[PDB]
Design an enzyme around this catalytic site. Structure first.
Site, mmCIF file in Angstrom:
data_model
loop_
_atom_site.group_PDB
_atom_site.id
_atom_site.type_symbol
_atom_site.label_atom_id
_atom_site.label_comp_id
_atom_site.label_asym_id
_atom_site.label_seq_id
_atom_site.Cartn_x
_atom_site.Cartn_y
_atom_site.Cartn_z
ATOM 1 N N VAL A 90 52.783 -58.477 88.397
ATOM 2 C CA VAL A 90 53.723 -58.727 87.288
ATOM 3 C C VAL A 90 54.158 -60.296 87.566
ATOM 4 O O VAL A 90 54.807 -61.031 86.681
ATOM 5 C CB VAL A 90 54.838 -57.817 87.091
ATOM 6 N N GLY A 129 54.334 -68.818 93.622
ATOM 7 C CA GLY A 129 53.012 -68.021 94.022
ATOM 8 C C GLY A 129 52.801 -66.940 92.964
ATOM 9 O O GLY A 129 52.805 -66.899 91.929
ATOM 10 N N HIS A 130 52.727 -65.433 93.339
ATOM 11 C CA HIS A 130 52.571 -64.475 92.604
ATOM 12 C C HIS A 130 53.391 -63.201 93.070
ATOM 13 O O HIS A 130 53.807 -63.046 94.324
ATOM 14 C CB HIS A 130 51.131 -63.858 92.852
ATOM 15 N N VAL A 131 53.909 -62.595 91.939
ATOM 16 C CA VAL A 131 54.921 -61.380 92.269
ATOM 17 C C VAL A 131 54.133 -60.029 91.950
ATOM 18 O O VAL A 131 53.529 -60.092 90.640
ATOM 19 C CB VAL A 131 56.188 -61.738 91.526
ATOM 20 N N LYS A 161 56.917 -60.849 96.552
ATOM 21 C CA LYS A 161 56.382 -62.221 96.439
ATOM 22 C C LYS A 161 55.794 -62.907 97.504
ATOM 23 O O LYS A 161 56.409 -62.887 98.499
ATOM 24 C CB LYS A 161 57.583 -63.292 96.011
ATOM 25 N N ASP A 174 68.659 -73.899 87.960
ATOM 26 C CA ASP A 174 67.519 -73.498 87.070
ATOM 27 C C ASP A 174 68.030 -72.119 86.212
ATOM 28 O O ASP A 174 67.160 -71.361 86.158
ATOM 29 C CB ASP A 174 66.316 -73.629 87.692
HETATM 30 C C1 LIG Z 1 60.630 -57.630 85.762
HETATM 31 N N1 LIG Z 1 61.289 -57.474 86.935
HETATM 32 C C2 LIG Z 1 60.915 -58.842 87.919
HETATM 33 O O1 LIG Z 1 60.394 -59.728 87.108
HETATM 34 C C3 LIG Z 1 61.287 -59.102 89.235
HETATM 35 C C4 LIG Z 1 60.887 -59.889 89.899
HETATM 36 C C5 LIG Z 1 61.183 -60.227 91.322
HETATM 37 O O2 LIG Z 1 60.883 -61.270 91.892
HETATM 38 C C6 LIG Z 1 61.697 -62.261 92.590
HETATM 39 C C7 LIG Z 1 60.565 -63.339 93.264
HETATM 40 C C8 LIG Z 1 61.476 -64.194 93.879
HETATM 41 C C9 LIG Z 1 62.810 -64.220 93.946
HETATM 42 N N2 LIG Z 1 63.336 -65.157 94.761
HETATM 43 C C10 LIG Z 1 64.781 -65.795 94.436
HETATM 44 O O3 LIG Z 1 65.263 -65.487 93.371
HETATM 45 N N3 LIG Z 1 65.143 -66.961 95.398
HETATM 46 C C11 LIG Z 1 66.329 -67.702 95.355
HETATM 47 C C12 LIG Z 1 66.231 -68.867 96.154
HETATM 48 C C13 LIG Z 1 67.473 -69.622 96.106
HETATM 49 C C14 LIG Z 1 68.597 -68.995 95.476
HETATM 50 CL CL1 LIG Z 1 70.106 -70.158 95.657
HETATM 51 C C15 LIG Z 1 68.591 -67.914 95.009
HETATM 52 C C16 LIG Z 1 69.954 -67.256 94.171
HETATM 53 F F1 LIG Z 1 70.846 -67.398 95.036
HETATM 54 F F2 LIG Z 1 70.140 -68.144 93.003
HETATM 55 F F3 LIG Z 1 69.671 -66.292 93.784
HETATM 56 C C17 LIG Z 1 67.195 -67.094 94.869
HETATM 57 C C18 LIG Z 1 63.685 -63.343 93.263
HETATM 58 C C19 LIG Z 1 62.763 -62.139 92.721
HETATM 59 C C20 LIG Z 1 61.979 -59.223 91.847
HETATM 60 C C21 LIG Z 1 62.312 -58.095 90.964
HETATM 61 N N4 LIG Z 1 61.981 -58.092 89.861
#
Ligand SMILES: CNC(=O)c1cc(Oc2ccc(NC(=O)Nc3ccc(Cl)c(C(F)(F)F)c3)cc2)ccn1
Lengths: 321, 266
Positions: A29, A30-32, A49, A141
């Site tokens: 659903v 790099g790749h997640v 991820k 972002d």
């Molecule tokens: C439908 N469901 C999904 O799509 C889904 C996708 C997921 O994938 C993810 C993949 C990567 C991340 N990585 C971050 O978020 N990194 C991050 C870096 C800096 C900073 Cl500052 C922050 C912050 F603090 F802003 F939060 C966050 C988070 C979620 C997880 C769960 N569910």
């Protein structure tokens, strides 16, 4: 290899590997990936991820460094980091968030958003960002796709702020100062994005929707069609922006004379005398030094007006997504 | 700066402020090869190597400090034979530079810096040239991250010191000396045992004593355990006597030969 043999073999024997602990066969659903524990003593969904590129890039280091320290209910929790030594790949583990705000809004734009839910989404986004800002962490972002929301389980309807493109196009949420060449990200830039999200929650359409280096003419035009063109008294240091001259050359005030946020929100059924509108207006201020802070926004009387925000944004309702 | 003011719920505080007795127990492995004196000489030495690497690469002091803490954490847990400290030192500088948002030192610049620094400043200890390449740095980096459990943000005494001297109104008189004493605390275990603010207070006190500044009243009206500060002050006072008695350039070749070395594959 020059490292101690016994040291190496001990660590390799004991090292947790993602492929041993988690089943992610497909489910990309790099790749997640959506993942389940292989042990079975756990029925909760997880997201994995794999970091793009080999080893650990600047952005990767930063993502890991920050997530390791950050702890707040509305910021996604890093549960675990797996280091894959043979291929030098890095894996991040998180709890799976069933929903995100991009699909939630698309669903309601298609069926056509309850007001209690809008308020609670806004409050929790502000809560999370307030925590980040107090720790001098900028998101940079914010947009609906980065606002996750937990489904059934112990965190039902809890917002989780994520940054899923931290390594690295839509400019619908970008503050005007960035479009006029501002050189640094700021807390105010995040606040403008939140304002864009709030407006979109209120109307189901992106407020600065626009057709697809920092200067983006059509995007600014869309911002002015909605907001009007800022008077000098509204943004006195606009003239310090690197692209200010370009703006003067391309745009004329007169083009946007009958434009304002009041008029835009009026044709989308949002009342100008509502506490919602007045908050929105303090968030979507063109001059970034005149934008409300996240903490000021949480104190807004909008959040004291019936209905109060809830810890479960779906509170008093069922989930149709 | 990121996570400023979060020390009390930080990974630094909650996982990487170690117990002294635990630390010395894990060190007994290496103390079968080196005397205690030789061990604290070795620590001074690698502190200096990391500082030289940092200066050559023109890194700010905070990045050097973070690199130094990474190095200490690794050898706080593991024996000097696990990974060659000559490899670990530049690996720590490389990771810290990325974490502190200064930059990714290029491959050739990192290796050129380690090669040059060892040859120019440390030829008394290292007659052979830096034998490691970037593939070794990258492998070491993974072992470093793993050991630290990805705990990358490190707090240091510079920021609190800055706040303390500004409060006194003695920035121009006491800051340069106290800052320099802070640098010198990295020659010891102090950063593994005490919160940075306490180390800052100890360094400032020593600076005051050295410059004959009366700051008793100021120290008296702090709400901190002065017993802990005094422990820190005693270590600082001791490190200068150790500094005096230690001839690094005459002793380090012999001491390095006494270090336990990596066992080869059998
Ligand atoms: C439908 N469901 C999904 O799509 C889904 C996708 C997921 O994938 C993810 C993949 C990567 C991340 N990585 C971050 O978020 N990194 C991050 C870096 C800096 C900073 Cl500052 C922050 C912050 F603090 F802003 F939060 C966050 C988070 C979620 C997880 C769960 N569910």
């Amino acid at each position: 290899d020059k490292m101690d043999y016994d040291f190496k073999v001990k660590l390799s024997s004991e090292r947790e590997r993602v492929e041993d602990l988690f089943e992610y066969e497909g489910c990309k659903v790099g790749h997640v990936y959506k993942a389940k524990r292989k042990d079975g003593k756990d029925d909760k969904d997880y997201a994995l991820k794999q970091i793009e590129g080999t080893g650990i890039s600047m952005s990767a280091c930063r993502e890991i460094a920050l997530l390791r320290e950050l702890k707040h209910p509305n910021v996604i929790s890093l549960q675990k980091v797996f280091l894959s030594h043979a291929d030098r790949k890095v894996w991040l583990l998180f709890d799976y968030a069933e929903h995100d705000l991009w699909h939630i809004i698309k669903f309601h734009r298609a069926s056509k958003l309850p007001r209690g839910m809008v308020k609670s989404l806004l409050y929790q986004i502000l809560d999370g960002i307030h925590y980040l800002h107090a720790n001098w962490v900028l998101h940079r972002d914010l947009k609906p796709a980065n606002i996750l929301v937990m489904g059934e389980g112990p965190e039902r309807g809890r917002v989780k702020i994520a940054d899923m493109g931290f390594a690295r196009v839509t400019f619908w949420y970008r503050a005007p100062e960035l479009l006029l060449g501002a050189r640094h990200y700021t807390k105010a830039i995040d606040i403008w994005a939140i304002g864009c999200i709030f407006a979109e929650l209120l109307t189901s359409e992106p407020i600065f929707h626009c057709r697809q280096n920092p200067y983006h003419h059509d995007q600014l035009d869309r911002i002015f069609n909605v907001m009007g063109f800022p008077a000098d008294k509204d943004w006195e240091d606009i003239k310090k922006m690197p692209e200010h001259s370009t703006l003067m050359k391309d745009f004329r005030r007169n083009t946007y004379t009958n434009c304002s946020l009041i008029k835009y929100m009026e044709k989308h059924k949002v009342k100008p005398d509502s506490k919602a509108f007045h908050l929105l207006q303090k968030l979507l201020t063109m001059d970034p030094i005149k934008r409300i802070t996240s903490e000021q926004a949480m104190q807004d009387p909008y959040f004291l007006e019936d209905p109060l925000p809830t810890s479960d944004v779906f509170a008093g309702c069922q989930i149709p997504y | 700066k990121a996570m400023a003011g979060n020390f009390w719920q930080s990974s630094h505080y909650l996982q990487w402020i170690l117990d002294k007795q635990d630390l010395l127990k894990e060190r007994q492995k290496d103390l079968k090869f080196l005397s205690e004196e030789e061990y604290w000489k070795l620590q001074i030495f690698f502190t200096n190597v990391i500082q030289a690497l940092g200066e050559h690469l023109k890194l700010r002091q905070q990045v050097i400090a973070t690199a130094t803490v990474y190095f200490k954490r690794f050898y706080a847990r593991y024996s000097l034979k696990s990974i060659d400290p000559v490899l670990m030192a530049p690996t720590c500088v490389f990771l810290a530079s990325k974490v502190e948002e200064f930059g990714v030192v290029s491959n050739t610049r990192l290796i050129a810096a380690a090669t040059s620094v060892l040859k120019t400043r440390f030829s008394y200890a290292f007659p052979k040239e830096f034998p490691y390449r970037m593939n070794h740095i990258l492998e070491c980096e993974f072992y470093l991250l793993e050991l630290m459990d990805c705990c990358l943000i490190v707090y240091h005494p510079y920021r609190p010191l800055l706040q303390y001297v500004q409060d006194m109104g003695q920035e121009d008189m006491l800051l340069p000396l106290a800052w320099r004493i802070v640098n010198d605390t990295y020659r010891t275990d102090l950063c593994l045992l005490y919160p940075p603010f306490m180390i800052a207070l100890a360094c400032l006190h020593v600076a005051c004593v050295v410059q004959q500044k009366d700051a008793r009243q100021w120290f008296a009206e702090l709400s901190v355990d002065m017993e802990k500060i005094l422990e820190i002050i005693r270590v600082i006072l001791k490190l200068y006597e150790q500094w005096k008695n230690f001839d690094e350039r005459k002793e380090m070749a012999t001491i390095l030969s006494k270090m336990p070395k990596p066992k080869p594959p059998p």
